[PDB]
Design an enzyme around this catalytic site. Structure first.
Site, PDB file in Angstrom:
ATOM      1  N   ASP A   1       0.878  -1.057   0.097  1.00  0.00           N
ATOM      2  CA  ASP A   1      -0.082  -0.020   0.025  1.00  0.00           C
ATOM      3  C   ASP A   1       0.903   1.351  -0.072  1.00  0.00           C
ATOM      4  OD1 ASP A   1      -2.617  -1.808   0.151  1.00  0.00           O
ATOM      5  OD2 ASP A   1      -2.193  -1.467   2.263  1.00  0.00           O
ATOM      6  N   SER A   2       2.109   1.169  -0.447  1.00  0.00           N
ATOM      7  CA  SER A   2       2.621   2.483  -0.686  1.00  0.00           C
ATOM      8  C   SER A   2       2.872   2.813  -2.504  1.00  0.00           C
ATOM      9  CB  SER A   2       4.381   2.509  -0.269  1.00  0.00           C
ATOM     10  OG  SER A   2       5.051   1.423  -0.511  1.00  0.00           O
TER      11      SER A   2
END
Ligand SMILES: [Zn+2]
Ligand SMILES: [Zn+2]
Ligand SMILES: [Zn+2]
Ligand SMILES: [Zn+2]
Ligand SMILES: [Zn+2]
Lengths: 65, 97, 114, 497, 47, 245, 99, 187, 138, 127
Positions: free
Chosen positions: J4-5
C-alpha cells in the site's frame, strides 16, 4: 482555478489552448471529443488536462475587492 | 513518545533488564531522594552544604540513605502518606527476623 | 524538509570524483568503478558497449539505491588487458557511433520539407 | 542523576513496609501548623501566610528557601505539614473496614466475641493470613450479638453481657440497633442511635495486642485506632502545584481548594465548642468536616459529588490520581513518556537489509548518543564537534568531568576545540547505531526490534519488507516509534538480544 | 496488585494489615526504577 | 408541546410460565412499589370485575386470556370502591403520618397529571386513561400467550431525530423559566415603595443570550450543569475540508 | 426544522405559564443586529460575524401587557430570517458569501 | 535569605539572559556555554476548562452543589445545602459577596461590559474598606462603580443618562464624584 | 440519504375532528362484543375510538393528503389484518419520497401517476434556468 | 510500492500535480489593567521568547509579504511588561497571507494573522 500550463504527464504546452477550446465548443458547436483533437490534443494524458479542468477562476473574479 | 505498558512487556519478554531501567529512569523520571534508615519515609531534611541531614521525630542524624527512584514514584509515595498510608522503604532484603 | 537539493543529481560536491576505481577482490583482472552523479543513462550505455568487446569476460552495473544518483560498474577482462582500457575503448566506440548518428540525422533532416 | 553530591550512601530499595500514620507520628514528622485557609496575600503584599503552603514547606517564585534545606523548586522533596481536627473523623477507605471491626469486637470493654473456648474460633485463629483470619473471625461472630460471660469448656471469660448493635452504613456514619429491656422496659422499640467517632476511638484504643494479631494489624505499623483520622497530614507544594495562564493572578490546584474547605469546616467547628455551644446543632458541622476530609480522598461514593461549576468538575481527590490508566501507577510509573524517541510515517525500501532502518536525516540530527572521549575515537569525535549540530555527521552538547554541558549551537568553548579524555560527546545518531524500533500495539517481542541505523534523506522511517509481518505493519500511513539506547550496556542488550 | 484494577483499595487493605513487600516482582522494580529479576537481572556480576 | 414530561409506566407480569398464580402489576412514578392493575382501575372509577376485564379483553369468547386475568382479580378482591382503591396507594413516597385524606389527593393528582400524562392532564378524562391501561395489558398478554412476538426495538419507524428546532426549544424553556423565576424575586423585596416596574424587566436580555450561546458554543446542552451528559457534543464546529465533507 | 421553531414553536413557547400572579402576546424577530459600544445598532452579515467572532443573532421582541426586548436568537444561516435566504447570486458575491 | 540565580559560574557577568532554548532547555550561557539545571517547566501549558482559578476578592473555594447522576441527592442535597447555608453565618461572610452579586445584577440589567464593568466593582471593594469620609449610602458609591464600569467604552453612558436613571442624582452623587478623584490620586 | 427529510410537526386536532365527522365512533361508547369487525384508530399514540368500514375512511384520507388538505408529512398506516389505523403527526420521523402507482387507468394495467407529459413539463422549468416539486406533490 | 505504498511521477509533481495551498490563521485579543499590541523590549521583567521579533512592525503585527519560519514572532503582545505574544508553530513555516485588525463588541482589538504555504507531494504524503 485557471488552465494548467503544460500537462502533468506529457508536459506538452496546454495553458495556451483554453479559450481556443471554449470557442470550439460554444460557437463552432462541436463535441468535446473533436474539439480536443483539433487543438492537437491527441493522447489522453494531454487530453484529460483540458476536458477535466474546472475554470473556478471565473467565480473567484466575481468577488468585488 | 509514549513507552507505555505494552512496550515494557516486550522489553521484559526480551529479558532486557538494564535497557528497561534506562528507559523508565535515566530517560524521563529520575530523581534522588533521601530516606530515614528507621522509618522508610522521605522525611529527611536535605542540607547539602553543611552535611546536615536530620529526620526529626526519628532523631536520625547518622542513619540516612539516598536512593534513585522515578519522581512519579516519589509522588505516589507522598500522595499515599497524604492519605495516611506509610510506604516505608528499606535498603536491606535481609529482613529484620 | 529532508529533501535533498535537485542539483545533487548531476553536480559533484566536495570530495566526490566522477570516478572511483577499486580492484575487485573476488576475481582476477577485475575492477569496480564507482560513478558519481550519474544514472542508468550512462550505466546501461557503457555496460552494453563493454559487452561487445570479445576480450571482456564480465561487465555489469547497478544503482545501489534510487535516492542517490550513483552507480557501480564491474569489469573483468582477459589477462593482460586492462579493464580501464576496455572502458576507454567502449567510451570511444560510443562517441563515434553517436558522432555518426548526429551527421546521418542532420543529413536526412535537410532533405526534408516542412 | 542531575543534582548535587551527597555524603549519604546510595542504595536500592529492598522492602516496602506498608502501614498507617499514628496521629503522633504525623505531628512528629510535620513542620507546618496551618491555621489559615488563605494562601499568599497579606494586605495584598505577596508572600505566604503561616496558613497553607509556606511556614517551613517548599516554595514558589524560584526561591531557594525551604526548611533550611535550600535547593529550591527542584530537588526539594516536598515536606509534610500538620493540621489538627476538632472532633476526630473517619477515613473513607476504611469505613468499610471499621464496620467489620465493630461488628467483630463487642462495644464497651473492647474484647473479642469469641475465645479459644469456641471450637469454630480455634480453627480460625490457627490461620496465618490477615485476609483469611479477619474474614473467618468476622463470619464466625457477626451473628452473635451478646458478649458471653460464660461458655461451656460453663467456663468464665470477659464479663459484660451488653447487647451488640446491628450496624448499617448510611452515608459517612454508622447507625446501630439494640434489643433490650425484655418487653417490660419501654414497650417494643429498640434504641436506634448514631455511633460517633469519639466512641469508636475508645473502643479501638482499648483493644489489646492479641486482638490486633487476630485481625490484620501489626500494633507497630497499624493499630485499628489509626483507621480513624485524628491528625491529618498536609501534602507539600510539589504534590499540589500552582502557576497559571495569564500572570497577574493565582492559578491554584484542586487539592488545595479541598484543604481550604477542610480548614473552614474545622475552624467553624472549634468556634462553636468554645463560644456558643447549641448542643445537637453542632453535629451539622462535624459531618461536613467528615465529608471534606473524606472527599479530599474520594468523590465517587454513594453520597453526593463536588464543586465547582468551572475548574475541572468534578474534582480529583487523590483517588482519581492513583486510579488505573491515565493516572500514576498505570500512566506514570509503569508507562512513561521517555526522552530520545522519534516517530514518523513508514515506507518500504527493498534496497535496505533486513536488520536496518532508514532514519530520516533530520531525526538523526536531533537524536543524540552520549559517547565517551577515548584515544580510540578522538579523531572522529573532535571532527564531529567541528561539524556542529547542523551537518549530519556532527554533534550537539559536550559533557565533562564535573557535569557541565557545552551547547554547541550557541557559542561553545573557544576556537578549534580541544577534546579531553573522559569528556562525553553527545553525537548525532550515525550509521550502524543500535536502535529500538517498534509499531503499536506492541503485543509481541516482534513488535519491538533493534535495527542498524542508516541515515537517509526524506523524512520517513524506511524498513525492509520482510520485517513487515512482525510489526504487523503496512505503509497505508502507519506511523512507528524509535528509541535510542543511551548506555554502553544498553546498546549491547539491543544488538545481542 | 497495584498495577491492576483495584489499586487504591488494595493499598488501603495493605496499609491496614502491614504488608511487607519483598520487591522481587518485575512490576515492583519497574515502579522503583531498578533492575528486575529478568534475564539480565537474574544473576549478579562480580569482579 | 409545552414542558415535555417523561414519566414511563410499566405494566409487569409477575410469574414465569407455570409459576404459582401469575399476577399483573404496575410501576408508577414517585411510588416505592407496584400496584395490581385491578386496584388502579377501581382507583380510576371502574370498580366491578368484568367491567374491568371488558377494558382489557376485547371478546367474551376469549376464555384463554380471561383465564390469565383470574389471579389478577384475586389480588384486588380486597378492594371494592373508588375511595379504598385511591387509598390502597396510601399515597406512597410521602408516607408516615397524614392518615387518609391527604394521601387520597396525592393519588388523584398522580392519576391525573403524572400517570399516562399524554392523552390529557386535566380532570374528567378517567375513562380514556382506564381504556389505555387496559389496552396496554391486552398487548402485554398477547405476547404472554405467544399470539404475538416481542416488540422490535430496532424498527426505525419507531425512532425520531431531534433537529435544531426541538433542541433549542428544550434550552429556551429552561432559560425562559430561570428568567420568569428571577422576576418573581425582584418582584419581592420591595416591601412597598409603590411603583417597582423599572426595577424589574431587562433580565431576559443577558440570561437567555448566554444560555443560547453557551450551548451552541460548547456542546454541553444544559447551561453550567454539564452533569447532564447531553454534553455529548451536539453542536460541533463545522467540517470544511472538502465541499462534500 | 428551524423555520418551524422561529415561526410557530417559538410563539407557542412564549404562551404557557407566561401569565403571572403580566401576560406576553405576539413575539417579533428582527434580522440579525449588532449591539456594540461606541455606536449605533448595525445590520450584521454572515461574513462580518465570522471574521469579528460575533454571534449571528437577531432581535427577539415581545409584546408585554400590564414592544419589549428579550434576548438574541442565533439564526440558522439560510432560514427565513437570514439575509442570504432571499439574496441572489450577484448579491451573495457582494456579501462575500459563497453562492 | 532567598537568593535565586542562574549565573554561569565559570565567567560571572552579573548578569545576562541565558536563553530559554527551544527543545534542549537548560539555558546554556552564550558565555561559558555550560548548563544550569534541566528546566522542565512548561508555563504555556496552563490548566484549561477541560484546577485554575482567577480570584479578585480574597480566595475562592466552593462547597457542595451536588448533581452527579449516580445516586440521587434528594435527601442528601437538602442535608448539605442546608448545612452549607448555616455556615455562611460564622464570621461576617455577607458583605463582599452580597456586594458583588448585587453588583453583577445592576450592571447586567443595563448591559454593562464585563471587562471594565467588573473592573469598577473591584474599585468598590477597595472603597468599601478604608474609612475616608464615605457617608456611605451603598447606592452612592455604586454610581462610581457604574461610571468606571461604563469607562470600558461608552457602553451605556453617556454616564449622565445612567445617572438620570433610577434614584439619587444630586448631592449624594457629589460625595461619590469626590471619592473617585481621591482614589485615582492615591498611589 | 439524499432524498430523506424529517417531519416537522403538524396540528393533530383538525384530523381528530375530521375523523369523528366520517365515522370514528368515540371511545366512550365502545361495545367490543357489539362491533367485532370494527377497526381501532390511533392518532399520535392516543386511542381516539373505533370505526366500522375503515376502507372508505382510508381512501378519503389519502386523497386529502394527495390533494394537499392534510399535510403530506402526516403518516397514515392501515394494518388491515390487525384491525388498526395509526395516524402520526409527530415531529422527527424520517421519511422519503416515492412515485404513486394507483392502478386507476382504463387504458390497461397498473401504472405510475407521473407521466412522460409531466416530465417535459418539469424539464420545461429546467430550461428557463412554473412546474415545481411541490406541484408533483400537490 | 508494496504493501500500500505508491510510486509517483516526480516530473508531473514539478508540473503541479497534486499541489495544495495551506492557510493557518493565528488570533489574539486584548481596573486600568489592559493588554497591548506592540513590539516588546524587556523592562524589567524579561519574560520573552526565543523567536525573532525583528519581523514585527510597531503595531506588533507582521506585514503580509514577510516570509516567516521556525518560532518567529507573528504577533507582539505586552501588559510592568510581561510578554504574551503568539509565535509561529514550531514545525510550520510559510508566508503571511493577510492580517486583519477588528473590534469584538466589547471594544476589543482583534487580530487574525493568516499564514500561507504551498505543500508539494513528498514521499510520505498519503493518497
Ligand atoms: Zn498529456
Ligand atoms: Zn525517621
Ligand atoms: Zn526541601
Ligand atoms: Zn463487652
Ligand atoms: Zn558562562
Amino acid at each position: 482555478m485557471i488552465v494548467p500550463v503544460r500537462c502533468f504527464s506529457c508536459g506538452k504546452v496546454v495553458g495556451d489552448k483554453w479559450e481556443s477550446y471554449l470557442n470550439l465548443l460554444q460557437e463552432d458547436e462541436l463535441d468535446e471529443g473533436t474539439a480536443l483533437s483539433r487543438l492537437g490534443l491527441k493522447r489522453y494524458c494531454c487530453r484529460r488536462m483540458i476536458l477535466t479542468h474546472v475554470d473556478l477562476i471565473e467565480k473567484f473574479l466575481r468577488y468585488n475587492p | 513518545l509514549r513507552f507505555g505498558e505494552m512496550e515494557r512487556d516486550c522489553m521484559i519478554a526480551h529479558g532486557a533488564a538494564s535497557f528497561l531501567k534506562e528507559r523508565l529512569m535515566e530517560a524521563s523520571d529520575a530523581f534522588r531522594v533521601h530516606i530515614c534508615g528507621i522509618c522508610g519515609l522521605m522525611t529527611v531534611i536535605a542540607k547539602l552544604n553543611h552535611n546536615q541531614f536530620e529526620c526529626k521525630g526519628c532523631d536520625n542524624k547518622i542513619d540516612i540513605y539516598q536512593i534513585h527512584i522515578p519522581y512519579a514514584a516519589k509522588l505516589l509515595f507522598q500522595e499515599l502518606m497524604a492519605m495516611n498510608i506509610t510506604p516505608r522503604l528499606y535498603t536491606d532484603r535481609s529482613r529484620d527476623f | 524538509m529532508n529533501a535533498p537539493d535537485r542539483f545533487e543529481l548531476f553536480l559533484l560536491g566536495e570530495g566526490e570524483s566522477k570516478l572511483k576505481i577499486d580492484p575487485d577482490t573476488k576475481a582476477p583482472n577485475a575492477v569496480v568503478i564507482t560513478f558519481e552523479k550519474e544514472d542508468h543513462t550512462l550505466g546501461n550505455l557503457i555496460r552494453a558497449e563493454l559487452l561487445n568487446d570479445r576480450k571482456v569476460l564480465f561487465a555489469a552495473y547497478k544503482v545501489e539505491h534510487p535516492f542517490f544518483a550513483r552507480f557501480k560498474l564491474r569489469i573483468q577482462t582477459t589477462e593482460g588487458y586492462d579493464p580501464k582500457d576496455a572502458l576507454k575503448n567502449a567510451c570511444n566506440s560510443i562517441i563515434n557511433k553517436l558522432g555518426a548518428l548526429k551527421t546521418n540525422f542532420e543529413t536526412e533532416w535537410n532533405l526534408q520539407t516542412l | 542523576v542531575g543534582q548535587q553530591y551527597s555524603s549519604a550512601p546510595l542504595r536500592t530499595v529492598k522492602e516496602v513496609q506498608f502501614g498507617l500514620f499514628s496521629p503522633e507520628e504525623v505531628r512528629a514528622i510535620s513542620v507546618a501548623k496551618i491555621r489559615f485557609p488563605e494562601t499568599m496575600d497579606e494586605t495584598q503584599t505577596r508572600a505566604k501566610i503561616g496558613g497553607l503552603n509556606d511556614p517551613r514547606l517548599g516554595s514558589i517564585d524560584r526561591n531557594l528557601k525551604c526548611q533550611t534545606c535550600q535547593e529550591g523548586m527542584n530537588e526539594c522533596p516536598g515536606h509534610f505539614g500538620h493540621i489538627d481536627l476538632a472532633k476526630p473523623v473517619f477515613h473513607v477507605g476504611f469505613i468499610a473496614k471499621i464496620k467489620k471491626v465493630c461488628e467483630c469486637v463487642c462495644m464497651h470493654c473492647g474484647k473479642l466475641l469469641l475465645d479459644e473456648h469456641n471450637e469454630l474460633m480455634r480453627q480460625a485463629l490457627a490461620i496465618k493470613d490477615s485476609k483469611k483470619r479477619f474474614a473467618a473471625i468476622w463470619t464466625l461472630c457477626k451473628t452473635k450479638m451478646v458478649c458471653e460471660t460464660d461458655v461451656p469448656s460453663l467456663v468464665s471469660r470477659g464479663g459484660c453481657g451488653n447487647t451488640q448493635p446491628t450496624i448499617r452504613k448510611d452515608g459517612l456514619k454508622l447507625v446501630g440497633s439494640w434489643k433490650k429491656d425484655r418487653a417490660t422496659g419501654d414497650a417494643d422499640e429498640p434504641e436506634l442511635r448514631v455511633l460517633s467517632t469519639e466512641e469508636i476511638l475508645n473502643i479501638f484504643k482499648h483493644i489489646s495486642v492479641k486482638d490486633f494479631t487476630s485481625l490484620g494489624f501489626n500494633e507497630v505499623f497499624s493499630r485499628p485506632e489509626w483507621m480513624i483520622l485524628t491528625c491529618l497530614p498536609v501534602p507539600p507544594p510539589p504534590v499540589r502545584p500552582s502557576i497559571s495562564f495569564n500572570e497577574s493572578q493565582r492559578g491554584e490546584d484542586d487539592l488545595t481548594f479541598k484543604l481550604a474547605d477542610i480548614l473552614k469546616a474545622n475552624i467553624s467547628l472549634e468556634t462553636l465548642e468554645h463560644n456558643g455551644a447549641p448542643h445537637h446543632a453542632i453535629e451539622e458541622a462535624e459531618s461536613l468536616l467528615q465529608f471534606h476530609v473524606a472527599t479530599y480522598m474520594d468523590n465517587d461514593i454513594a453520597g453526593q459529588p463536588q464543586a465547582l461549576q468551572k475548574s475541572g468538575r468534578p474534582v480529583k481527590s487523590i483517588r482519581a490520581r492513583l486510579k488505573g490508566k491515565e493516572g500514576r501507577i498505570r500512566g506514570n510509573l509503569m508507562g512513561k513518556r521517555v526522552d530520545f524517541s522519534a516517530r514518523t510515517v513508514i515506507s518500504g525500501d527493498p534496497n535496505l537489509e533486513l536488520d536496518q532502518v532508514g532514519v530520516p536525516k533530520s531525526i538523526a540530527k536531533t537524536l543524540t548518543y552520549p559517547e565517551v572521549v577515548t584515544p580510540y575515537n578522538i579523531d572522529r569525535l573532535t571532527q564531529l564537534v567541528r561539524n556542529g549540530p547542523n551537518e549530519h555527521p556532527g554533534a550537539k552538547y559536550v559533557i565533562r568531568d564535573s557535569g557541565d554541558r557545552i551547547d554547541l549551537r550557541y557559542s561553545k568553548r573557544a576556537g578549534d576545540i580541544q577534546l579531553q579524555y573522559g569528556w562525553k560527546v553527545e553525537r548525532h545518531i550515525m550509521d550502524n547505531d543500535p536502535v529500538l524500533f517498534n509499531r503499536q500495539p506492541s503485543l509481541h517481542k516482534m513488535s519491538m526490534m533493534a535495527h542498524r541505523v542508516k541515515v537517509i534523506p526524506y523524512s520517513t522511517f524506511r524498513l525492509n519488507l520482510s520485517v513487515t509481518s512482525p510489526y504487523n505493519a503496512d505503509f497505508d500511513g502507519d506511523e512507528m516509534n524509535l528509541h535510542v539506547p543511551q548506555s554502553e550496556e544498553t546498546r549491547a542488550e539491543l544488538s545481542q538480544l | 496488585r497495584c498495577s491492576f484494577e483495584e489499586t487504591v483499595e488494595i493499598l488501603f487493605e495493605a496499609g491496614a494489615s502491614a504488608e511487607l513487600d519483598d520487591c522481587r516482582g518485575v512490576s515492583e522494580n519497574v515502579i522503583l526504577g531498578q533492575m528486575a529479576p529478568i534475564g539480565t537481572g537474574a544473576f549478579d556480576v562480580m569482579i | 408541546k409545552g414542558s415535555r414530561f417523561i414519566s414511563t409506566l410499566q405494566v409487569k407480569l409477575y410469574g414465569r410460565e407455570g409459576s404459582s398464580a401469575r399476577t399483573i402489576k404496575a410501576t408508577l412514578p414517585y411510588i416505592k412499589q407496584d400496584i395490581p392493575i385491578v386496584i388502579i382501575f377501581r382507583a380510576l372509577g371502574i370498580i366491578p370485575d368484568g367491567e374491568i376485564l371488558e377494558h382489557i379483553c376485547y371478546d367474551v369468547n376469549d376464555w384463554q386470556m380471561l383465564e390469565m386475568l383470574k389471579p389478577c382479580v384475586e389480588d384486588g378482591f380486597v378492594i371494592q370502591d373508588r375511595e379504598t382503591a385511591l387509598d390502597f396507594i396510601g399515597r406512597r413516597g410521602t408516607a408516615l403520618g397524614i392518615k387518609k385524606e391527604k394521601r387520597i389527593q396525592y393519588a388523584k393528582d398522580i392519576l391525573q397529571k403524572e400517570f399516562l400524562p399524554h392523552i390529557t392532564q386535566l380532570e374528567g378524562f378517567e375513562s380514556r386513561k382506564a381504556f389505555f391501561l387496559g389496552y396496554m395489558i391486552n398487548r402485554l398478554l398477547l405476547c404472554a400467550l405467544d399470539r404475538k412476538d416481542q416488540d422490535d426495538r430496532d424498527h426505525f419507524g419507531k425512532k425520531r431525530l431531534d433537529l435544531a428546532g426541538p433542541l433549542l426549544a428544550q434550552l429556551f424553556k429552561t432559560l425562559f423559566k430561570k428568567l420568569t423565576k428571577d422576576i418573581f424575586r425582584y418582584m419581592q423585596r420591595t416591601v412597598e415603595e409603590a411603583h417597582d416596574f423599572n426595577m424589574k424587566l431587562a433580565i431576559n436580555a443577558k440570561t437567555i443570550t448566554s444560555g443560547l450561546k453557551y450551548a451552541l458554543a460548547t456542546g454541553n446542552w444544559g447551561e453550567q450543569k454539564k452533569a447532564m451528559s447531553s454534553r455529548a457534543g451536539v453542536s460541533q464546529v463545522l467540517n470544511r475540508y472538502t465541499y462534500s465533507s | 426544522s428551524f423555520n418551524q421553531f422561529v415561526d410557530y414553536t417559538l410563539q407557542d413557547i412564549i404562551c404557557e405559564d407566561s401569565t403571572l400572579i403580566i401576560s406576553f402576546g405576539k413575539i417579533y424577530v428582527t434580522k440579525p443586529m449588532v449591539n456594540e459600544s461606541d455606536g449605533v445598532t448595525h445590520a450584521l452579515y454572515p461574513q462580518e460575524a465570522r471574521l469579528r467572532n460575533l454571534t449571528y443573532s437577531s432581535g427577539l421582541f415581545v409584546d408585554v401587557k400590564k414592544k419589549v426586548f428579550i434576548g438574541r436568537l442565533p439564526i440558522m444561516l439560510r432560514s427565513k430570517n437570514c439575509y442570504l435566504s432571499e439574496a441572489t447570486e450577484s448579491d451573495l458575491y457582494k456579501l462575500k458569501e459563497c453562492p | 535569605n532567598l537568593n535565586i540565580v542562574l549565573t554561569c559560574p565559570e565567567c560571572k557577568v552579573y548578569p545576562p539572559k541565558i536563553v530559554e532554548r527551544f527543545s534542549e532547555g537548560d539555558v546554556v550561557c552564550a558565555l561559558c556555554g555550560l548548563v544550569l539545571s534541566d528546566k522542565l517547566v512548561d508555563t504555556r501549558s496552563e490548566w484549561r476548562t477541560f484546577e485554575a482559578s482567577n480570584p479578585l476578592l480574597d480566595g475562592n473555594n466552593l462547597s457542595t452543589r451536588i448533581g452527579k447522576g449516580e445516586t440521587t441527592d434528594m435527601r442528601f442535597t437538602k442535608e448539605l445545602n442546608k448545612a452549607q447555608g448555616k455556615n455562611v453565618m460564622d464570621k461576617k461572610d455577607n458583605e463582599v459577596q452580597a456586594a458583588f452579586a448585587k453588583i453583577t445584577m445592576l450592571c447586567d440589567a443595563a448591559e454593562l461590559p464585563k471587562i471594565v464593568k467588573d473592573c469598577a466593582k473591584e474599585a468598590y471593594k477597595l472603597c468599601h474598606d478604608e474609612k475616608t469620609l464615605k457617608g456611605k449610602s451603598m447606592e452612592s458609591i455604586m454610581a462610581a462603580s457604574i461610571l468606571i464600569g461604563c469607562r470600558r467604552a461608552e457602553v451605556a453612558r453617556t454616564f449622565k443618562e445612567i445617572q438620570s436613571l433610577i434614584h439619587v442624582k444630586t448631592k449624594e452623587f457629589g460625595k461619590t464624584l469626590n471619592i473617585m478623584k481621591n482614589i485615582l490620586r492615591g498611589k | 440519504s439524499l432524498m430523506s427529510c424529517i417531519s416537522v410537526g403538524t396540528d393533530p386536532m383538525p384530523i381528530i375532528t375530521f375523523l369523528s365527522e366520517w365515522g370514528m365512533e368515540p371511545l366512550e361508547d365502545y361495545v367490543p362484543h357489539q362491533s367485532p369487525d370494527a377497526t381501532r384508530v390511533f392518532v399520535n399514540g392516543v386511542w381516539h375510538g373505533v370505526h366500522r368500514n375503515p376502507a372508505r375512511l382510508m381512501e378519503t384520507l389519502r386523497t386529502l393528503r394527495r390533494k394537499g388538505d392534510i399535510n403530506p408529512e402526516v403518516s397514515m398506516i392501515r394494518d388491515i389484518r390487525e384491525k388498526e389505523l395509526k395516524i402520526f403527526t409527530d415531529a422527527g420521523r424520517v421519511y422519503r419520497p416515492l412515485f404513486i402507482v394507483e392502478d386507476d387507468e382504463s387504458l390497461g394495467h397498473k401504472e405510475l401517476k407521473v407521466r412522460k407529459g409531466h416530465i417535459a413539463k418539469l424539464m420545461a422549468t429546467e430550461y428557463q434556468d412554473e412546474y415545481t416539486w411541490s406541484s408533483l406533490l400537490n | 510500492n508494496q504493501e500500500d505504498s505508491m510510486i509517483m511521477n516526480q516530473s508531473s509533481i514539478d508540473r503541479g500535480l497534486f499541489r495544495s495551498l495551506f492557510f493557518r490563521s493565528y488570533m489574539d485579543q486584548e481596573m486600568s489593567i489592559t493588554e497591548t499590541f506592540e513590539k516588546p523590549q524587556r523592562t524589567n521583567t524579561l519574560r520573552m521568547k526565543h523567536g525573532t521579533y525583528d519581523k514585527l512592525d510597531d503595531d506588533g503585527l507582521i506585514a503580509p509579504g514577510v516570509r516567516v519560519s521556525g518560532e518567529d514572532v507573528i504577533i507582539g503582545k505586552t501588559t510592568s511588561k510581561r510578554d504574551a505574544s503568539t509565535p509561529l508553530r514550531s514545525t510550520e513555516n510559510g508566508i503571511v497571507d493577510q492580517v486583519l485588525v477588528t473590534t469584538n463588541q466589547d471594544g476589543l482589538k482583534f487580530v487574525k494573522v493568516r499564514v500561507r504555504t504551498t505543500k508539494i507531494p513528498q514521499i510520505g504524503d498519503k493518497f
